[PDB]
Design a protein around this ligand. Structure first.
Ligand SMILES: Cc1cccc(-n2nc(C(=O)O)cc2-c2ccc(OCc3ccc(-c4ccc(C(=O)O)o4)cc3)cc2)c1
Length: 123
């Protein structure tokens, strides 16, 4: 409906990144999904997601959720709620947000556009 950015958990990305809040169940929009190079291991998908205010490109899908991508329920523009996630920190200090459980609330086709004008979150 009207006021589209009101559909997303504005501020959730900062909360995840600045506070390390892990109990929230934020509603985010998928902006993009891309496979990452794994080779011989099952594919892994990296997601660029939006909370309406920020985007963040450091989301990774748990392997168990691969069929959502492969069968196309989880795709660019869809709106989803993250029911479980974990943050992992790499040796170089970058952090990855692993999506363990997610629900697609509205299909890419039913949403159809990037919501609002989110700006890239920087670290
Ligand atoms: C900083 C950042 C954020 C998101 C993705 C990347 N990335 N981009 C590329 C690439 O070359 O495209 C490759 C990677 C990348 C980065 C880190 C990686 O390893 C970390 C990592 C990945 C997954 C898991 C994990 C825990 C539980 C599960 C599961 O259930 O599947 O998966 C735990 C740690 C794996 C891939 C980097």
């Amino acid at each position: 409906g009207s006021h589209m950015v009101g559909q997303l958990s504005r501020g959730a990305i900062a909360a995840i990144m600045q506070k390390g809040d892990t109990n929230i169940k934020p509603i985010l929009q998928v902006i993009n999904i891309r496979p990452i190079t794994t080779g011989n291991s099952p594919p892994r998908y990296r997601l660029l997601m939006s909370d309406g205010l920020n985007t963040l490109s450091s989301f990774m899908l748990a392997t168990q959720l691969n069929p959502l991508v492969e069968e196309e329920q989880l795709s660019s523009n869809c709106v989803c709620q993250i029911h479980r996630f974990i943050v992992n920190t790499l040796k170089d200090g970058r952090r990855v947000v692993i999506l363990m459980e997610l629900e697609v609330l509205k299909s890419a086709e039913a949403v159809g556009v990037k919501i609002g004008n989110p700006v890239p979150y920087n670290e």
